[PDB]
């Protein structure tokens, strides 16, 4: 509906809409040949259908081609300083499609205006609608037009015969914010069956990771979505469909040490998996420093030859 | 439905704008891989 709207507001009064609680599909918009410019900052166009955003903003206006480049972070220009300024850390996509045949008319468009004068520059996502006469010189005009005192707004007069530099261009700016909140806008990705007690990848409402999901004794309040430990890592999530809290545990890992007598005697080796139970790895001895595979555990006691740990040592007979 | 021909024609018409006129493009790609060099400049050799 924002893309198909018949009329687009003026730049000095760019129209902002909020989008939430729906499933978006950016593949159609990106793959379409209609849009002329499609630039995404802080995100890539090919992955917008894989992410989830807390809230989407859609800002619509109409400019000309020569200044379409001014809709970008850290730009300098009349729009960049007086009409519509984007934040430096902008996260979103800017789409412009030529619109000669929608807006431009014989005689010129008098309904499309842009601010040409202002006392100071604008701030990001700030809209100014005041029509106070600008004091160009040092003479206070007290709201009276004349020399060194101009009306800030200035008309466009889009003529269909004008060159592409001055031709109408409809621009829509999709602004996404990726913060800690229950995301309401998500791509068209079908959900799958949930599995527990296994080392699996998980994508919970746009939060990716790898680990084991288990039933949790934690009691989340009915506003919290995910929990974190002391070290600030996501260790508990809420299922977006059943509202069931699941603990996240990183899959069992560790170091691997090779215990060997010198090759200069024999080629046999033993493998110690540090801090790892060897019912998780797929004769065999379980120690405090992990478990040892390839070494025979005995009742005897000798002087330590190869230190294993926790009072356990290994040697070649 | 929605099946369209994969190709499209430039239609280089002689009196066109500078953005539509035919420009010949040659791209030279150099391989700096470890190998005996075959192409060098006109740099003259010198006694060892």
């Amino acid at each position, epitope marked *: 509906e924002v*893309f*198909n709207a*018949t*009329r687009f507001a003026s730049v000095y009064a760019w129209n902002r809409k909020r989008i939430s609680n729906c499933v978006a599909d950016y593949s*159609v*918009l990106y793959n*379409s040949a*209609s*849009f002329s410019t499609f630039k995404c900052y802080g995100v890539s166009p090919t992955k917008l259908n894989d992410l989830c955003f807390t809230n989407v903003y859609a800002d619509s206006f109409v400019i000309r081609g020569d200044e379409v480049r001014q809709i970008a972070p850290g730009q300098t220009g009349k729009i960049a300083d007086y009409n519509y300024k984007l934040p430096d850390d902008f996260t979103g996509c800017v789409i412009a*499609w030529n619109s*000669n*045949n*929608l807006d431009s*008319k*014989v*005689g010129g468009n008098y309904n499309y205006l842009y601010r040409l004068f202002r006392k100071s520059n604008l701030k990001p996502f700030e809209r100014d609608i005041s029509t106070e006469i600008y004091q160009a010189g040092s003479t206070p005009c007290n709201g009276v037009e004349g020399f060194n005192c101009y009306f800030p707004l200035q008309s466009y007069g889009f*003529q*269909p*015969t004008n*060159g*592409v530099g001055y031709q109408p261009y409809r621009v829509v700016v999709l602004s996404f914010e990726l913060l800690h909140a229950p995301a309401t806008v998500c791509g068209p990705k079908k959900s799958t069956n949930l599995v527990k007690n296994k080392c699996v990848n998980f994508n919970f409402n746009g939060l990716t990771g790898t680990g084991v999901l288990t039933e949790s004794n934690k009691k989340f309040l009915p506003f919290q979505q995910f929990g974190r430990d002391i070290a600030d890592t996501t260790d508990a999530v809420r299922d977006p469909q059943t509202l069931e809290i699941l603990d996240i545990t990183p899959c069992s890992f560790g170091g691997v040490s090779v215990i060997t007598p010198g090759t200069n005697t024999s080629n046999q080796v033993a493998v110690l998996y540090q801090d790892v139970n060897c019912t998780e790895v797929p004769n065999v001895f379980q120690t405090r420093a992990g478990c040892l595979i390839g070494a025979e555990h005995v009742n005897n006691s000798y002087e330590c030859d190869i230190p294993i740990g926790a009072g356990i040592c290994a040697s070649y007979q | 439905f929605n099946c369209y021909f994969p190709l499209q024609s430039y*239609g280089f*018409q002689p*009196t*066109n*704008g500078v953005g*539509y006129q035919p420009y010949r493009v040659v791209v030279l790609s150099f391989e700096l891989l470890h190998a005996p060099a075959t192409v060098c400049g006109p740099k003259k050799s010198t006694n060892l």
Partner: antibody
Amino acid sequence: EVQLVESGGGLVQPGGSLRLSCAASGFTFSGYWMHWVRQAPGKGLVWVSRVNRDGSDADYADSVKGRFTISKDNAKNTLFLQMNSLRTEDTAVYYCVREATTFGVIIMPEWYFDLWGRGTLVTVSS
Amino acid sequence: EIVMTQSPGTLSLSPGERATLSCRASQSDSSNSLAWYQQEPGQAPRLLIHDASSRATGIPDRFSGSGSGTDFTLIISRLEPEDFAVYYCQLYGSFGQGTRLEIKR
């Protein structure tokens, strides 16, 4: 099939008022821009007016500036063209014409017509 | 604003001989979005070619023209007894004076 039927017209004294209707059948009226084209008796064609998908904007020609009003009643599937202070030189036949649209992600008209309905002759004289 | 000028004003040929016609935009270029219409005197005008290159579906393949910049030409491959009409070119805001494709005797 797709056709446009024009209704109204006739002899009206100079300075009078008249309203013309354009009923469209065979296609979806809502998605297409519409225009009006005049044809003077034994003369060339001249563009008159232009209307959007809902009628927000108008593209009234200089000849008909301030005297002709076009309306697009999408709910009851009709186009309307009503004028005031009509002058003698405007004697012609009117053509209700359509604007081609791609109907893709963006409607994107192309300023070329597709079908022409049967014209309606209008006359003004004393 | 923009004025369409048609050349030649009139053009008569044999019933089989082909012909070409050229329109002239007064100034500037309009992205080559030009249309030709053939109007039989009794009937309403009919679209022939749109965007100055591509011919509308249902029109005979014989009608095939192309142009760019100031000039847009349409050329007809052959002729039959249907050219007794006026060919008007149409850009955004104006129609051409037209040309009567006559039959020679």
